[PDB]
Design a protein around this ligand. Sequence first.
Ligand SMILES: CCCCCCCCCCCCCCCCCC(=O)OC[C@H](COP(=O)(O)OCCN)OC(=O)CCCCCCCCCCCCCCCCC
Lengths: 96, 80, 344, 97, 317, 163, 105, 112, 98, 67
Amino acid sequence: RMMRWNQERRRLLIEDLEARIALMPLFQAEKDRRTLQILRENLEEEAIIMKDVPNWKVGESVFHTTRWVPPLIGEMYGLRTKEEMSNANFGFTWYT
Amino acid sequence: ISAFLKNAWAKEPVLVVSFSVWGLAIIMPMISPYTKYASMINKATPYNYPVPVRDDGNMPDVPSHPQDPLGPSLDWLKNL
Amino acid sequence: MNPITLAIIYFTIFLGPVITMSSTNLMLMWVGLEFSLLAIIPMLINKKNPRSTEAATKYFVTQATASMIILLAIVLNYKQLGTWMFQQQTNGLILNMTLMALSMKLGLAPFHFWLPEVTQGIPLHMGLILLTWQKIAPLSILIQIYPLLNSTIILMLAITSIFMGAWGGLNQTQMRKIMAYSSIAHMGWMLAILPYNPSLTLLNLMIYIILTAPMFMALMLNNSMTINSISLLWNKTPAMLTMISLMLLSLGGLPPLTGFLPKWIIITELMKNNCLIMATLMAMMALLNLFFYTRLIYSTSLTMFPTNNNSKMMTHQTKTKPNLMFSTLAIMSTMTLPLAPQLI
Amino acid sequence: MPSTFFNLTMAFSLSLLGTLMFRSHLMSTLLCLEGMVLSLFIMTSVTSLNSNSMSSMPIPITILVFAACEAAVGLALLVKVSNTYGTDYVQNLNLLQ
Amino acid sequence: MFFINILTLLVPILIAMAFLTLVERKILGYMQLRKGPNIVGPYGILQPFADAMKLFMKEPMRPLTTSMSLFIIAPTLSLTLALSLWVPLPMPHPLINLNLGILFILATSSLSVYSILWSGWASNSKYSLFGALRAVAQTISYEVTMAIILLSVLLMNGSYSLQTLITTQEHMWLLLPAWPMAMMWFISTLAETNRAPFDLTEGESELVGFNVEYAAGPFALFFMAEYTNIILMNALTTIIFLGPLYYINLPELYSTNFMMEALLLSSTFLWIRASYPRFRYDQLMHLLWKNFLPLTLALCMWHISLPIFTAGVPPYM
Amino acid sequence: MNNYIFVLSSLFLVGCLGLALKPSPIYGGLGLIVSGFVGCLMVLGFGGSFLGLMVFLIYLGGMLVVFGYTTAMATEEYPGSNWLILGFLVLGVIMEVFLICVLNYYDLGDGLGDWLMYEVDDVGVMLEGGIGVAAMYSCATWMMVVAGWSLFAGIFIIIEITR
Amino acid sequence: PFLDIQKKLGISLDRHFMFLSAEQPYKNAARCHAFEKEWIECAHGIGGTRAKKECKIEFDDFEECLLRYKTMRRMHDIKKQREKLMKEGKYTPPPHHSGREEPRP
Amino acid sequence: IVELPTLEELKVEEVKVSSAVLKAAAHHYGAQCDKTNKEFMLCRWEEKDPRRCLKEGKLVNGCALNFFRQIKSHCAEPFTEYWTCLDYSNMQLFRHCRQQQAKFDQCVLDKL
Amino acid sequence: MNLYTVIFINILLSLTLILVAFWLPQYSEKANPLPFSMKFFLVAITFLLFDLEIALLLPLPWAIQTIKTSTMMIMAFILVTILSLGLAYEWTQKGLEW
Amino acid sequence: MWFEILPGLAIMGVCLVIPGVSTAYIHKFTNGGKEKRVARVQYQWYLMERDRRISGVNRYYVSKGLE
Ligand SMILES: CCCCCCCCCCCCCCCCCC(=O)OC[C@H](COP(=O)(O)OCCN)OC(=O)CCCCCCCCCCCCCCCCC
């Protein structure tokens, strides 16, 4: 009865994981355009304001590749509310 | 030898079991009809996303759609 | 020792250096070093005499802290380069740590205090292993990383060792410690050429092994830990007096014997690289090493020390023979010089 | 992390200064020695964790497994010493002079 | 209302423990043909308040202890952990959800050993030091048999989450797959409380153990923490081996049936105290090192195969 | 807070400074058991539930406990008042503050910002330590074998030393 | 290494996991998997002495994918600037700081 | 300046429905709206940059809302009873809402 | 957090109960109240060399779900066995014996 | 007789179900009438957070599809 049952928990997981397969496109699309909306919106707050003294170039990627550096948690929410930094940096460890 | 096991089963009736199940578990996998599936039921789980390959027309098997008759169809895991 | 234990230990003392040499993932090189530390300690206390426990407890603490420092270098590298292994980019301090640490396990220079003392409290046999099959491991790690280590430090540890080894040896009369001191010295030459031509380190080691292994099996044939003890060699076993004479002068650099080649080519390589400052001072005090070697020569061969009456009793009884290795390693060592070109 | 990684490193150096400056009891040393292994274990685990380098997590533990036995050997030497002298003071370990 | 949860999580276990002091005196009594407390309350329901409100008023004599720092940190460590191993307990709804839950329960359980070590060492006495060294030997030796039983079993529910054990048991109790584990678990939960046929420490006839020099409060806490994890290590058996009903609706039934089986396993320990002469310190070990540990290691090897050959590898999550 | 780790890091140094002043053999064991608790916490901070708990399970109660154990058996002769040490320790408590202070004014800095959990998949599973430690059985099965021999020949090394 | 009993025997017990770009479990690429590749397919066939000068672009980048310090200096500087201006009110917490601004999926 | 698309550009009608309903209508969202979602991935894994496939992203955010829009007209009430029980759980298991599943599947086997 | 709150509350309760214990009460020689257990030390490092054993056996829960299941099985069995043979040697050595 | 040990258990029999029923209703009342969702793996959190973003600041609140 532990043979025949744990097999089923597997088949329920496949049912439960393939659901997750169908929704990677929607989430990865939202996640791309969201984080790609944070740092134009943070590029602004850095450029629109906060930067009128000399020798500063807004959006000075520090790498040379020009490939897409997946933004770091810090750069993504850091200059934003103290709450956001934790909710991104300690939201899961703190539970559920 | 066979009657030495008889006192070792009367007195010391523990190590017998511990060297009778230590081993039993080494032979059950090598001789079972269903041991093949453990590396397969554990191979089917799509934990990460299956990246689709670009079409060239040179790939007949690759099932074009999730519901095509083609591809890894597990009517096995069902009623395994 | 339950022969099973003997096997497990000996296997570890032998798997220890071999894992170090074979692996490239430094981590696996560290555990190779760690095993060697664990395997050697049981053998060191085999007599379990009060001197022995002291020996092992020192050897272990010296070995353990160095092992921890080597691990720290690997841990630091992991954060300066994701790799688990030293690379061109490695921070200089990261490598220097590895030099100091590894120079402690090998016991070179200002960390040369543990070796003479552990060589004094362990048996002649385990003395050999502690001196020669435990130097292979750390040296491997250094030889692998030679392109990256500092020429300055190595040289300082090299020169220091040569001096400490020589000076220490002059005063010592206990043989085990005379050898411990020699090993410090030879170990010094070896680490001098590492930055320039590692391949010569591997010659200055083998020759040291082919010289020291016969020398110790000689000391134990009569199990003499005293020069006075080796001096009565003429009565206990007269034949080994001839080769003991040449091997010890070979250990020092005198020209006809095999021992000159390691010093000669190391000097040739250092002059090729322009260290004619360093090489000169090393060769000069290297000459101090021969003085204490010849002082022993005097006592054991060139002059016959007086013996006790009971020595006649030990002559009567058949002397258990010296293994064949003695011969094959005495000759290949005392006289191969005519074949130097192919050795290098 | 860069900030913290410093604290752990100095912890290892403070533990380094400890094991290289004995005082009476040896068990103190061995204990200190262990303080390093903890600092190394913590640092290895920390960087592996923020490099998302899961292929390397095996190491943080291999470090502990080898370090534990290493310490086992160390303590057996210690017990051997306070069986031959019964006071475990680094002070009496000087016969080899 | 998270604080409402702790207040309704620690009050209803310090108020339960208290009436285990009572129930450990009556059930033992009627087996001894002797009524327990009947007088201070209706049927002894009001006796623990007396010696609660009494022990705390007796002089906490720091008897020339080597170090108070320990004398007063050991007893607090205990009740601190014991009342913490309840935080991740897998009720139909656990106070806190902790993947690695079962490890948490294992780890915290271990720290307890210190209380024995520290208390014994601080209070300068032969008995104290003697008992401690001997006692922890037992405790530690039994961790190695608990862990494996703990590990082995895991392969079956397939995760370290207490909260999944309930699902794994959605249709059966794990007592039937693993009664060998559950036997040795029972002794590893009955002898890791320094309790029962196994009370070597606090050997009373032979040793007067560590808590000997403790009195009044410092004692009460040590005690309170032996009866607040006399209910844990039975509460786990009512989770890991005896699986009560769990329905998305009616989420109490589980707690109710959790009750019915935890009291038996908490009332099953009480038959033991009143039934078995104590094991001698040598025998206890030989029970674990030369009998249980072998069977435990082999059966662990058996359980790693069972999934593979039965293809029953449990679902992560 | 954001200085969730720093503070802890600072506590880890304090515990190491305590072990470094070499306090009485068992009073300092506590010290280790303290910083081991502290190091257990930091790793948890970064998401290493397994790796973290592991330390709290093995070094904390396994190694350390056995350590003091032996202290009691020997080298707990409990013959400088640790209080003197605590006095010095207090000095270091703030002396380290001095070391940090210079770099404090120099200033990363201002506590701890996003200098933890650099990159984490905002979607996805199987991302969790213990999946990496379980590479001992797939793709890193040599670390597992050599650890075995350590412990295995450890038995034989210990008994031989003991005997 | 010193004695390559591994290449000879063909076994790979110690090489499969030496760099961050090695096979990570469940194909979970680590941070920088992009760079280290670019910095070791570059230095392949070119020895170190010449993996240290011309293949310096890829290490200078990989030294900042992982240390990620030049970033700090940028961000830390930015931080200070905000502080000074803000103190004189020259700069105001952005709408982002004010929250809202339509936090979206 | 590193290219960072204009916020205006990023604007797209969005799904804005809680995870529970997505988990209910997911297996049908894999059947339908697949050609429009896999091509996003096929750009996403080939072209490793979220600043280039935003094209197909707006398509994914489009076909999905299409999927539901039909379900909202067609067979909405039995869909509401389905996820309304499924979201009651703590991990949203199909294992419980198994009767609500066929009642929604037969309603959607016939229609659409 | 919650876990912090709880564990911290659990401490405060412990401390209070000893606070009240040493204060509620508010001389006489009332206060007035060894060889090595080599066996014990052995038992102790036997436990160290075994606790680390568990630490290398805890991955099983997450390795059972590895593709190379056949490999895991093999790797595990050896560990459990080599450790049993160690215990067994101890048995013969009589180290286990008290 | 033995009738009397029951008064005692009765309290340890409610003192032990007060916790299991309590924790399992202070969850269904501090999570909007629905079990407290369990975030065991990154993907569960994301979904949970996403929900908060979709409606109110509370995960618990849910958008039926009219949103
Ligand atoms: C490049 C030249 C280097 C130098 C070469 C010349 C020196 C050789 C080394 C000599 C070193 C030892 C000097 C002192 C020896 C003392 C020997 C002695 O005391 O006699 C006893 C000894 C053993 O006795 P046993 O053979 O058992 O029987 C007699 C028992 N009373 O009796 C014996 O040992 C007998 C055997 C002695 C060894 C014979 C060696 C003969 C000389 C070798 C010369 C080689 C020249 C090579 C030239 C190369 C040119 C390119």
